[PDB]
Structure formats: structure tokens, C-alpha cells
Amino acid sequence: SMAQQFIDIGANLTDDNYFGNYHGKHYHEEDIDVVLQRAERNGLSHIIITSGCLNDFKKAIEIINKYQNLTNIKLVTTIGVHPTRTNELKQEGYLDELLLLCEKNIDKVVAIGEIGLDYERLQFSDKETQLSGYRTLSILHQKYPYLPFFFHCRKSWSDLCQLNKELGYNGCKGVVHCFDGTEEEMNQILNEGWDIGVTGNSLQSIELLNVMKQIPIERLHIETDCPYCGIKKTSAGFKYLKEKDFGVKVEKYQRNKYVQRRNEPSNIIDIAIIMSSIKHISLFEFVNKVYSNSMNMYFPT
């Protein structure tokens, strides 16, 4: 009976922090329940739990199995291997196990992702391994040609665009998420038929604000990428917020309070506020249209 206002197209709910673990130490009880309660209280109706490898996918499925009966929020996930974990594709049986898990849980899967290329993180999966892995991952689109994409792109757009063409992705639906590129990259992305997802990282500088305000409203999605990417007091976008609660130190954890530096699905409102302000669109009109974008992209009827 709560409002249905937000779809978080990218929540990292498998992150250690939601199991009360911060850099290897256990601080508090696994609190996804209260994270979800706060999310419901702010009108989140669907949360796409991002998954980027076999372990993540197992975790995402466990969260959905455990919590779906305790929340009105639709919990779903994605199928794919993050460019930085494409090295894991070399282990024999890895891909088969991933594909079997996907098939058994296909009703929980709403995108192929998080997939793509990351040319700032080349130490576990080098450029060749990333390119190779992306090609291997095309089996997902082959098996499930109706699934839209959730793409990761860092300093790699020209290569990503070429690969998408080569693998026949062009003309499909998809979002380039956590976008922080240039105006020219934004326009090339839209020119290729894709949408753009905006997080707190997309809003960190005045230069980024001037790119994001140019995203056409009917091509825009919002997301938290939580626990990462919360608006900082340092952020350019912060100029547009009014009385943001930063929460409390993890040592002073309260069930009814935000943990400091732990972004949450409910913090998606920060993103809608900033975006609608810089685009000079009525907040509720903005909220409504972005909701519709994400529904038609990931939860079509």
C-alpha cells in the first residue's frame, strides 16, 4: 500500500556491508531487512541487485530467496561477469555452472549484466582477457535474446561500441550504467540506441552535471550502486540537496539510522532531486518519467 516511485536499476546488495562486514570485520547483524524497510518507506518498488560473477549471482539469489517474502519490493538480479572478473571464465566448469544457475533462476533475472569493459582496472583481467570474456558472454544473449543489457563502461567506450556491433547487440534494449563520460560519449551512446544510468558518481563535478543535464528525459535511469557512490558533501550535486542525513559511524550503529559511507537504495531520492533540479523539470514529473523508463526497460508487460 506504499507508493511506487523508484526503481533502483543497480543496487550492490550482495556487498559485505549489508551482512554487517566492513573491510573484514563484523560490526552489526545482516541488516538487509531494515535497508529494505527504508527503501519501501521511500517508494522503491523494484530493486535490481547487481551481480558480476558466479559468487555474486549465488549471493543475489540467496538474498531474493530469503527476503522476497519479507518485502513488497520486487527483488531481481542480473546475469553476467564484470569485465574485471572475466579471468574467472578460465576455470573449467565456471561458465556451465553460471548458465545452469541462471536457467534454474531465470524468473529472477531481468538483465544481462553487469557486463562490459573497464580499462582502468586491468590487474586481474587484462585488456585481452576482458575482450575475450565479453565475446564468451554473448552466449547469454544467444540463449535469452529478449533480455535487455546492463553495461559497464570505463575508458573503453570505443571498444565497447565496436564489440556490441560485432556481437549483434545493436538494436536491442540496454543501459550504460553509472555513466561518467563526456557529452560526446553520451551522444554516441544514445546514437547507438542505448539509455544512460546516473548514480552519485555521475554528479560529482560541475563538468559532469553539465553532461548529465543533457540526457533526454525518456532515456534516463537512476540507480544507487550502493554501498558505493553516495552523494558526498564534496560533490557538485550536493549544492542541490537540502539537509541530507549522512548517518552514524559504523561503531555507533543504530538499526533505525544510515551507516556512514554506506549508500542504500533509499538514497536514490538524492539522485532524482539533483537531476530534476539541473534539468529544470518538475520533480514529480521527473520521478514519474524515469520510473516509466525503468519499468519499460527492465519490467515490461
UniProtKB/TrEMBL annotation:
Keyword Hydrolase assigned:
yes
Query: Annotated Gene Ontology MF terms?
Result: 3'-5'-DNA exonuclease activity; metal ion binding
Tree of life domain = Eukaryota
Where is a divalent metal cation 2 bound in this sequence? 152, 177
A Pfam family matched in the record: TatD_DNase
Please list the residues that bind a divalent metal cation 1.
Answer: 114, 225
User: Species lineage, top-down?
Assistant: Eukaryota, Amoebozoa, Evosea, Archamoebae, Mastigamoebida
Q: Which keywords does this chain's UniProt record carry?
A: Hydrolase, Metal-binding, Nuclease
Concerning its family, UniProt says:
Belongs to the metallo-dependent hydrolases superfamily. TatD-type hydrolase family.
The name this protein carries in UniProt is Hydrolase TatD family protein
